[PDB]
Every structure is written in structure tokens, then in C-alpha cells.
């Protein structure tokens, strides 16, 4: 269904307007916790948009 999962991921997008939505859903399937997800993202767990 991903009803709650997608909704939660969308909530993070409303907090971090610089992270790709597809990268948010990545950990949303792992930890499944917006808290641990955004925290880990801020820790560098997810490769933030880096100009190459």
C-alpha cells in the first residue's frame, strides 16, 4: 500500500526542501521511522545533492 509510508516521506520533504524524494523513500523502507531517517540523512547516511 505504502499509504502511511509515502505520507510520512512527504512530511520529510516538507522539512528538507533540498533532498530528492526518491532518496527519502530509500531509508523509509529501512528504518521506517521519519525521525531516524531524517537524523541519519543529516548524518550523511544519504548522499546529499553534491555538484560534480
Amino acid at each position: 500500500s505504502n499509504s502511511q509510508l509515502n505520507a510520512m516521506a512527504h512530511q520529510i520533504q516538507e522539512m528538507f526542501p533540498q533532498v530528492p524524494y526518491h532518496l527519502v523513500l530509500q531509508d523509509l523502507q529501512l528504518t521506517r521511522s521519519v525521525e531516524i531517517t531524517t537524523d541519519n540523512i543529516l548524518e550523511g547516511r544519504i548522499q546529499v545533492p553534491f555538484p560534480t
Binding site: 512530511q11 522539512m15 533540498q18 531516524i36 531524517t38 537524523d39 543529516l42
Partner: protein
């Protein structure tokens, strides 16, 4: 002045602060409302992280601005 605190749970908290207020103090005010210690409180503004020893005037946070409160959990 009044500001809007955004949470990952989808709860907009309205708190009163001043431009000369310190980020650390703001987190302390949130701890009084939510109960979550400032140590696990990651304040983000416009996508940037707010350091404890900084004031609202540092990041140029005006009134009615939205502050993002990210929770920290080393679990999972």
C-alpha cells in the same frame, strides 16, 4: 515575536521567541512542550542546521518564520 515549529509528526507548534533569543533557549522551550531533550533536537532552517550557540538574528529568522525540528535517534 511568534514563530512556527514544524515537526516530523506533522504538528505545527506555535512558540514565542525574540530575534535576540539563542537557538539553545528555543530548544529548551520546545523541551518544555514536547518533553524531548534539546540534545536530541536538531533544529533546521531553510534546510540548514542551527547551532546551539547561535541567535535567531544570526540566520536572520524573522517573525512568522517556519523552523524545522528534526529528531535524532541512533536506533533503528
Amino acid at each position: 515575536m511568534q514563530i512556527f515549529v514544524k515537526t516530523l509528526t506533522g504538528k505545527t507548534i506555535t512558540l514565542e521567541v525574540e530575534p535576540s533569543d539563542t537557538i539553545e533557549n528555543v530548544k529548551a522551550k520546545i523541551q518544555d512542550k514536547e518533553g524531548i531533550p534539546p540534545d536530541q533536537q536538531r533544529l533546521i532552517f531553510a534546510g540548514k542546521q542551527l547551532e546551539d550557540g547561535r541567535t535567531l538574528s544570526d540566520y536572520n529568522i524573522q517573525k512568522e518564520s517556519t523552523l524545522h525540528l528534526v529528531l535524532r535517534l541512533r536506533g533503528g
